[PDB]
Amino acid sequence: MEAAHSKSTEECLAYFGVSETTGLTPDQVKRHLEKYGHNELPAEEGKSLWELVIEQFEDLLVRILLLAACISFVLAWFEEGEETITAFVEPFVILLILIANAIVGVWQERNAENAIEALKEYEPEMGKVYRADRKSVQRIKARDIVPGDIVEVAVGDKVPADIRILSIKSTTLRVDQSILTGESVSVIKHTEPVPDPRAVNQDKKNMLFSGTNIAAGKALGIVATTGVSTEIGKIRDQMAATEQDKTPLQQKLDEFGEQLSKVISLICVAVWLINIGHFNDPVHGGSWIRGAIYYFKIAVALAVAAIPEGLPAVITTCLALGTRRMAKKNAIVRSLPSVETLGCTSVICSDKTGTLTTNQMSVCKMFIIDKVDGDFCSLNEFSITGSTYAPEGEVLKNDKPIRSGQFDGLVELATICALCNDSSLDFNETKGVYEKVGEATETALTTLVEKMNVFNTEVRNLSKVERANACNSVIRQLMKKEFTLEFSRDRKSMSVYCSPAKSSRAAVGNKMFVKGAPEGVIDRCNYVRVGTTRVPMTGPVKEKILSVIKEWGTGRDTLRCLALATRDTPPKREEMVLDDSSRFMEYETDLTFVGVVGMLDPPRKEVMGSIQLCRDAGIRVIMITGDNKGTAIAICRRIGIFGENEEVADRAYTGREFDDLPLAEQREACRRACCFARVEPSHKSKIVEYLQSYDEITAMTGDGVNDAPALKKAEIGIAMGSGTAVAKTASEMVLADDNFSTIVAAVEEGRAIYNNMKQFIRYLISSNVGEVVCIFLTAALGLPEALIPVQLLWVNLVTDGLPATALGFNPPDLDIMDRPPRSPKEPLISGWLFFRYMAIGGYVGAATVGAAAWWFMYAEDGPGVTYHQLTHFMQCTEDHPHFEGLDCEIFEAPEPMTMALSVLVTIEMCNALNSLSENQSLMRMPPWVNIWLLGSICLSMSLHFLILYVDPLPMIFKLKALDLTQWLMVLKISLPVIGLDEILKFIARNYLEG
Numbered sequence: 002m003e004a005a006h007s008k009s010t011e012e013c014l015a016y017f018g019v020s021e022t023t024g025l026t027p028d029q030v031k032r033h034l035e036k037y038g039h040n041e042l043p044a045e046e047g048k049s050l051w052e053l054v055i056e057q058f059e060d061l062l063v064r065i066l067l068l069a070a071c072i073s074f075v076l077a078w079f080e081e082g083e084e085t086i087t088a089f090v091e092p093f094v095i096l097l098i099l100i101a102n103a104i105v106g107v108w109q110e111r112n113a114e115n116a117i118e119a120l121k122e123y124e125p126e127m128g129k130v131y132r133a134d135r136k137s138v139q140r141i142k143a144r145d146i147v148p149g150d151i152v153e154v155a156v157g158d159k160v161p162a163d164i165r166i167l168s169i170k171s172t173t174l175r176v177d178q179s180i181l182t183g184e185s186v187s188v189i190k191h192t193e194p195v196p197d198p199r200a201v202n203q204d205k206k207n208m209l210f211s212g213t214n215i216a217a218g219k220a221l222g223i224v225a226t227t228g229v230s231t232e233i234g235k236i237r238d239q240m241a242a243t244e245q246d247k248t249p250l251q252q253k254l255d256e257f258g259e260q261l262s263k264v265i266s267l268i269c270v271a272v273w274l275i276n277i278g279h280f281n282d283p284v285h286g287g288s289w290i291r292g293a294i295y296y297f298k299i300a301v302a303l304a305v306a307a308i309p310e311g312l313p314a315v316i317t318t319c320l321a322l323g324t325r326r327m328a329k330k331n332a333i334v335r336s337l338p339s340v341e342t343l344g345c346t347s348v349i350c351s352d353k354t355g356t357l358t359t360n361q362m363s364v365c366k367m368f369i370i371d372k373v374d375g376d377f378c379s380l381n382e383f384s385i386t387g388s389t390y391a392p393e394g395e396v397l398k399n400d401k402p403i404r405s406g407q408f409d410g411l412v413e414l415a416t417i418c419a420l421c422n423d424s425s426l427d428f429n430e431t432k433g434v435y436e437k438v439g440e441a442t443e444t445a446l447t448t449l450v451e452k453m454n455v456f457n458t459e460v461r462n463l464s465k466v467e468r469a470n471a472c473n474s475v476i477r478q479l480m481k482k483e484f485t486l487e488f489s490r491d492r493k494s495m496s497v498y499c500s501p502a503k504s505s506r507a508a509v510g511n512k513m514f515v516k517g518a519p520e521g522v523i524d525r526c527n528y529v530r531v532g533t534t535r536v537p538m539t540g541p542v543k544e545k546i547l548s549v550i551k552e553w554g555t556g557r558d559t560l561r562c563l564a565l566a567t568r569d570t571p572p573k574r575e576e577m578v579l580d581d582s583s584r585f586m587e588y589e590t591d592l593t594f595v596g597v598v599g600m601l602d603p604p605r606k607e608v609m610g611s612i613q614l615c616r617d618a619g620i621r622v623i624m625i626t627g628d629n630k631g632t633a634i635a636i637c638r639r640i641g642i643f644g645e646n647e648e649v650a651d652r653a654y655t656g657r658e659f660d661d662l663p664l665a666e667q668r669e670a671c672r673r674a675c676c677f678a679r680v681e682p683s684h685k686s687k688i689v690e691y692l693q694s695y696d697e698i699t700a701m702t703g704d705g706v707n708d709a710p711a712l713k714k715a716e717i718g719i720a721m722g723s724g725t726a727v728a729k730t731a732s733e734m735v736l737a738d739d740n741f742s743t744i745v746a747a748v749e750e751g752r753a754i755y756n757n758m759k760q761f762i763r764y765l766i767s768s769n770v771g772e773v774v775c776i777f778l779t780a781a782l783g784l785p786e787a788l789i790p791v792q793l794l795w796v797n798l799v800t801d802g803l804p805a806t807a808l809g810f811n812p813p814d815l816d817i818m819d820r821p822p823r824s825p826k827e828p829l830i831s832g833w834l835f836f837r838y839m840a841i842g843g844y845v846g847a848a849t850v851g852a853a854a855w856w857f858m859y860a861e862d863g864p865g866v867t868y869h870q871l872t873h874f875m876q877c878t879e880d881h882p883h884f885e886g887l888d889c890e891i892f893e894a895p896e897p898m899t900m901a902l903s904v905l906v907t908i909e910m911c912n913a914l915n916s917l918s919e920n921q922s923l924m925r926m927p928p929w930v931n932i933w934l935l936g937s938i939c940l941s942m943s944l945h946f947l948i949l950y951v952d953p954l955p956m957i958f959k960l961k962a963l964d965l966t967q968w969l970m971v972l973k974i975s976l977p978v979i980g981l982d983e984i985l986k987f988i989a990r991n992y993l994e995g
């Protein structure tokens with residue numbers, strides 16, 4: 002039963018048909034349980050090693066390798082008895098690759114954490130009900146509570162379900178709904194129904210939300226909803242229904258796999274055609290078994306050559322580094338793949354209070370009425386100093402200090418500020434600072450009181466531990482606070498019924514002290530206190546009052562104002578029902594205005610600039626605040642969301658206005674809006690959807706469990722470090738200092754990261770392109786494998802990885818934050834850059850094949866078969882008399898392979914230098930720009946020699962050191978690459994719209 006809040010205590014007992022005195026019966030219990038199910042959120046997502054591990058082998062690339070590893074394994078164990086036992090080091094390495102990346106995927110995910118799982122931390126294990134099967138209370142398991150049965154809760158207890166309160170046993174019930182609603186201060190509950198059927202949780206004063214805590218009291222109530230139908234359950238459902246897309250890069254990876262898959266097979270078709278003559282050859286002899294082995298060994302090589310096996314390692318090590326780098330700047334990024342999406346954010350929705358402002362209130366101006374006479378009128382504005390809650394400052398009229406006592410209007414303004422106030426101050430030795438006790442806007446008022454001690458009471462003769470609440474406790478012993486009418490958004494105010502202490506003063510006694518939003522409070526005033534006297538509130542004086550409030554809340558001050566009043570002759574105590582906030586506005590009427598106080602929540606230093614950066618970066622910044630409209634705008638101008646004189650009519654909306662619109666304009670408002678005031682949880686999710694309907698990468702801030710649905714729906718959920726853990730676990734990033742600027746600093750790094758990341762990716766991908774061209778030639782000619790999978794792997798993993806990771810530390814462009822947000826759909830390689838790698842690839846594929854074919858033909862160390870189709874090498878033993886008057890093992894020589902392998906290795910180091918910049922020539926951007934790059938190249942080259950000399954290595958890599966004259970052959974073949982590209986870059990920079 003929803004809406005329980007708008008129903009009466011009786012109607013709820015009626016609906017379920019249960020007795021507040023007996024509690025459901027067992028027949029009612031088991032029946033309700035088969036209709037409402039158990040009181041608990043659904044289980045977890047069932048994924049097992051079998052299932053988990055599978056995916057790790059779902060990726061097309063991985064699939065392709067797994068296959069190749071097999072063909073390899075088969076051949077590897079299907080040749081000579083011991084011609085080279087190392088026949089197995091090929092399939093084994095591939096497997097280790099796949100195996101290792103899987104062990105990564107698994108360990109990776111296992112250390113993840115579900116935001117929905119985090120919700121269960123708010124489910125109590127036990128609960129307390131009164132059922133017919135016993136007169137005394139039973140402490141059962143929460144999971145077994147049902148809609149309708151009578152529940153009992155008290156201090157310390159965590160609410161087990163959404164409960165409609167029946168009767169409060171204590172004198173007051175206080176609940177900590179921080180997580181849901183938000184208000185961190187314990188809020189007061191009642192029993193009377195809330196009219197509005199569509200009331201927001203914050204106003205369901207007669208409800209207990211499952212998951213919240215009883216800060217103070219004991220109550221009895223009936224369970225309205227259970228499990229998934231509770232406020233928090235409704236939230237779990239939204240998060241479960243949320244589906245996150247794949248990072249643009251992750252999409253590009255799948256798309257790239259789908260292609261690489263096609264090209265490969267197309268090459269096979271082509272290759273098969275190139276050697277179609279085999280179908281016009283002898284009907285006997287040859288070797289269908291040897292030619293086959295050949296085409297299969299080409300398959301496996303082709304595959305190893307087409308996939309960037311070192312990329313996974315390079316990409317993660319790059320992100321891991323950035324991550325740590327951002328943490329140093331207070332941006333904790335959980336989910337490495339997010340660093341990217343982060344960088345492309347186009348819109349940022351930020352909560353104001355804790356992140357755009359400091360949330361450290363302080364009163365700057367006061368004002369009481371000085372004189373009313375006819376239509377003449379004169380106020381007594383003031384100004385106050387001190388931005389800290391610290392009791393140190395001065396009050397001033399026209400910048401000139403003053404002793405507040407000389408004014409009676411201030412004597413009262415202060416008393417009201419000290420009595421109608423649930424908060425306070427406290428000094429600590431730990432940090433020697435004065436800390437806010439209750440709430441921020443109230444803890445500021447107690448502070449104001451100290452700074453204007455109306456009575457001049459001595460205090461410099463007091464420490465700081467007592468200086469805290471000194472001038473306040475005086476006013477506290479001057480009146481006796483009978484009771485307080487707590488704040489409610491309907492009347493936008495709160496009051497307190499005090500009664501004079503002793504007879505010493507006993508001045509008319511029983512006074513009512515109210516403080517609230519001006520509009521409301523001033524309307525309920527029929528009088529105005531001028532110092533010590535009273536006069537009837539009149540139109541003139543009213544205008545003069547509202548005006549100053551508008552200038553303080555709209556003007557460049559952007560101050561939040563609080564009207565302060567007193568009800569001189571309040572109703573008789575007996576005639577008041579202190580337990581139905583519905584009658585409180587009635588009690589707070591026929592008031593006399595005593596003064597207003599305007600306080601300020603200061604923007605943070607770094608925020609002003611940060612807002613500017615977003616402008617230059619093409620990132621839209623949307624403020625989400627509580628402050629009423631008009632004032633919200635003021636705040637936006639003050640921080641730069643709006644220009645002091647910039648129009649804002651259509652760029653600012655209130656939760657109401659927005660709801661009042663049709664899906665049509667609701668969506669339109671979102672593309673141009675920049676300020677949302679008096680919002681609501683429902684809105685944050687709606688606002689994201691719209692922003693998304695414009696393919697905008699939006700980041701959203703939040704911190705309570707009520708923000709999690711939206712935090713998880715945005716492209717980047719940003720949680721506050723001081724926020725709940727649920728908020729955190731549902732966001733991709735956490736602000737250690739809750740500072741907005743931290744966000745911008747993070748988006749920047751993101752853009753940086755992607756830029757280098759984008760280079761080394763192009764680099765590795767390009768090398769694969771060439772490696773493949775090589776393999777395509779070696780086989781389209783019918784010549785000996787110039788390159789082996791084992792070597793290719795070593796290169797794609799080790800020799801090329803080092804330079805690739807180095808490219809991760811490439812200097813960041815200085816204009817990063819001056820260009821708009823990168824389009825997610827922008828391809829890593831297309832247009833001219835494509836053609837370049839197309840060509841470069843074509844080059845290394847030739848250099849490598851030719852390099853090895855050179856040591857065969859034109860070599861001084863090996864028998865050069867000159868220009869005689871050395872390809873038919875397949876037929877030597879059988880035809881040792883037709884063009885073969887020499888050995889036949891020369892075709893499996895190590896020299897020709899180390900020849901082609903070394904041209905690759907060096908062409909790669911050259912390419913790793915052509916990758917320091919997409920278009921800038923090496924003369925303009927020299928290799929030394931990135932020390933790491935050069936240094937890594939030495940480790941690569943030497944590591945190359947490591948496998949040419951050290952025993953095990955060469956033997957198993959099919960490599961044998963080459964002399965100082967062959968090496969020069971390498972340099973002559975490879976080095977030119979730097980030139981080929983320099984030319985292509987020149988074409989891009991000059992003869993090309995770039």
Ligand SMILES: C/C=C(/C)C(=O)O[C@@H]1C[C@H]2C(=C1C)[C@@H]1OC(=O)[C@@](C)(O)[C@@]1(O)[C@@H](OC(=O)CCCCCCCCCCC)C[C@]2(C)OC(C)=O
Nearest residue numbers: 253254256257260261264307769770773829830835838839
């Ligand atoms: C690979 C070997 C051979 C023999 C081959 O044939 O590669 C072809 C050629 C083509 C592509 C292939 C499939 C790609 O297919 C695509 O769909 C595109 C449009 O990606 C693609 O066209 C380009 O690659 C790219 O843009 C960058 C793709 C980057 C993919 C990985 C992104 C990062 C993944 C991160 C995961 C966390 C250009 C590319 C290669 O040609 C040239 C000259 O670069």
Ligand SMILES: [K+]
Nearest residue numbers: 713715716718
């Ligand atoms: K998200």
Ligand SMILES: [Mg+2]
Nearest residue numbers: 183704705708
């Ligand atoms: Mg919140």
